[PDB]
Amino acid sequence: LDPHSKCYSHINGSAEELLDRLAVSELCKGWPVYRDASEWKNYRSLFTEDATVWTTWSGPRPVDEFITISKAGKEQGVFIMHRECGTLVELSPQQGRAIGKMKATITQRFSFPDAIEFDVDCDCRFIFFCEKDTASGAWKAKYVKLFYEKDKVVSVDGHQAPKFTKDELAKYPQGYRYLGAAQARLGYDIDLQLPTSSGQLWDRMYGEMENWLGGNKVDLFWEH
Amino acid sequence: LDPHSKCYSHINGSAEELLDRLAVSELCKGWPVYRDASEWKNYRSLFTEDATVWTTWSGPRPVDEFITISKAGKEQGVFIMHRECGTLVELSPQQGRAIGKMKATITQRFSFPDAIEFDVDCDCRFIFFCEKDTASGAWKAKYVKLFYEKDKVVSVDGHQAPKFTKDELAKYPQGYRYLGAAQARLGYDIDLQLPTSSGQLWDRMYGEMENWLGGNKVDLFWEH
Amino acid sequence: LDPHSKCYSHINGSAEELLDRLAVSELCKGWPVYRDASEWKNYRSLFTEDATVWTTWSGPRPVDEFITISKAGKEQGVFIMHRECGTLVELSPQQGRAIGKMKATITQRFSFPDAIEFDVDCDCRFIFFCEKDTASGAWKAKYVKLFYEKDKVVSVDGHQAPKFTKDELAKYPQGYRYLGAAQARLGYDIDLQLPTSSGQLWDRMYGEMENWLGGNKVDLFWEH
Ligand SMILES: [Ca+2]
Ligand SMILES: [Ca+2]
Ligand SMILES: [Ca+2]
Ligand SMILES: [Ca+2]
Ligand SMILES: [Ca+2]
Ligand SMILES: [Ca+2]
Ligand SMILES: [Ca+2]
Ligand SMILES: [Ca+2]
Ligand SMILES: [Ca+2]
Ligand SMILES: [K+]
Secondary structure (H helix, E strand, O other): OOOOOOOOEOOOOOHHHHHHHHHHHHHHHHHHHHHHOOOHHHHHOOEEEEEEEEEOOOEEEEHHHHHHHHHHHHHOOOOEEEEEEEEEEEEEHHHOEEEEEEEEEEEEEEEEOOOEEEEEEEEEEEEEEEEEOOOOOOEEEEEEEEEEEEEEEEEOOOOOOOOOOHHHHHOOOOOOHHHHHHHHHOOOOOOOOOOOOOOHHHHHHHHHHHHHHOOOOOOOOOOO | OOOOOOOOEOOOOOHHHHHHHHHHHHHHHHHHHHHHOOOHHHHHOOEEEEEEEEEOOOEEEEHHHHHHHHHHHHHOOOOEEEEEEEEEEEEEHHHOEEEEEEEEEEEEEEEEOOOEEEEEEEEEEEEEEEEEOOOOOOEEEEEEEEEEEEEEEEEOOOOOOOOOOHHHHHOOOOOOHHHHHHHHHOOOOOOOOOOOOOOHHHHHHHHHHHHHHOOOOOOOOOOO | OOOOOOOOEOOOOOHHHHHHHHHHHHHHHHHHHHHHOOOHHHHHOOEEEEEEEEEOOOEEEEHHHHHHHHHHHHHOOOOEEEEEEEEEEEEEHHHOEEEEEEEEEEEEEEEEOOOEEEEEEEEEEEEEEEEEOOOOOOEEEEEEEEEEEEEEEEEOOOOOOOOOOHHHHHOOOOOOHHHHHHHHHOOOOOOOOOOOOOOHHHHHHHHHHHHHHOOOOOOOOOOO
16 A cells, blocks of 8 residues: 655656755765764764764664763664665655655674674665755755664574564564664663554654645644 | 676766666565565556566466465465665666666565474575656666575574475575575475576576666566 | 865755766766676666776775676676665865765675575675766766675574684674674785775775865875
8 A cells, every 4th residue: 555645756856856855865864874983063064953863773863862872882882884875865845844755774783602703784765854954055954764664683603693582572663673672781771662564653654654745733742 | 707898877877867767766675575575556656557577486476466466465464575685777868768676685584384484585686677768768677586595594582493395495496596495485485497607597687687787578487 | 084175065055066976976876777687788887988996805906807807706606696775975066076875785695505505794885986078968877886884694594503612703893793704704904904884094084085075086005
């Protein structure tokens, strides 16, 4: 069933619209390129001053707070990388609004006690809620939240892998059960209210996407 | 050995040519972004009215028929996703023709009888045969067919994986033997006449690509 | 810690700057798209006449020499593919200089003596040192060198994988130990002086990147 109620500018169009979608596509790719490399000036430049991001392991965070705890995680040996897997844009020219749709694999490297190294690879879709500064013409992201689609445990040596009990996996939504369970082993409190490939929060996510493209305020804060 | 007989517009060039290649690149990415999310209005918008697509499990299908059977598959629990892996364009400005070259991984999630979950990941290259509406200037894809390069079985828990006999794999071309064999277990009749990294259909595929860029009709229907 | 001393044009900007970053992004993607398909005219067109590239298995090579030994490798059954994973650009408009940052997975298919097939998948970042021809306006890459971030052994059938001793892996920098060790088994002499996610050559790589963007000659030749 098609989750979109309407169509937006997404292919072809005018040169101005093509270059707006190009600009928004670059913002999206800035998360994998800049966060993975700790290029924090570049990473901060993607966002509005009042931006909020959501992850499994942080929940909602204002961007500057997110950067602080990301640095802390990296200092403690946390090793999250991203593989971008296909990026397109929904553009609403008269609202100065856009949604960046960036398919990705979150690929996080863990150890389990020579210790067993493993990745958890989660195929997901980052949704960038972007707006255009009428003065500057510049695009910036105000919100980033993800759909989580499927995940897997990846042996690093091809022989050894960790073990997760059924009960350990059961509290997480299907789509990020291994990623949540592994991050929980590091001590993080995991957000269980993130959208997957089906269900209530999937519908909600598309509703907020269309609200944004219609020019409204959105409500991505789903615990209150 | 270089499979191209000639060079086309593929880097640099005029702003018009850069924006034409950008527009075609977006069409390509629409298959992973829109099909994986069941965004059917968006997916249909990529194609001409008379478009045909080829897959391992469907063979050649008119696009609207392809969408119908894709919906049916998804309703029956079929779970194909795509990871886009590098997209460039060959442009023929005076013919209003272009070829979109999109590297990808088809990543299909299966079960084998707690049941063993596994992916088959097939590295492939989608070829989008695109044309420009002289009135509108809009680019649309008339044909999509793939090169299949290599594949593998991916354990989801890192311990358990299915088993395929040599005979089960033997009828498929090298490049999609695991993908074909696994899809056949679902009941699909698999097209065995799809191009891989070498051989007769590889040459044929490049021949039809250059025919398209030269302005000709192409012959991608390889059973008659 | 942020490895960049300064900011460059990387998002938004003028249409001219957006189209310059687009053009450079295409050059980057030409390595995965054209080298994997042996499209040698296309691949050669990415580079300046005096270009040099660095890989694990070749060390530094002038591009035309690199193409010769790549053809030889492919004739001997070498099977390297690339998955592009996110590409952005740092642009210095007044210097006519740019750095292409292309995240990728090198995915090389090997056999070990029915023989065990396996991939080594190395997440890496290609750095393309690009310059703009003032006459033509065309962008070309003068240098390509990579950061190597992490790697893994990938079973092809989901059951069998090769074994590497600790001593076999120990001489390689963390980030490409499996890739280096496997390529060494083919007979290649492996460059051990390539940058990873931390340390002296990581800092050096960012230093040379900023030198390039400042208009200087760079020194990427790290053995003399
Ligand atoms: Ca604009
Ligand atoms: Ca609404
Ligand atoms: Ca709320
Ligand atoms: Ca155009
Ligand atoms: Ca011909
Ligand atoms: Ca025919
Ligand atoms: Ca230009
Ligand atoms: Ca300097
Ligand atoms: Ca030197
Ligand atoms: K990609």
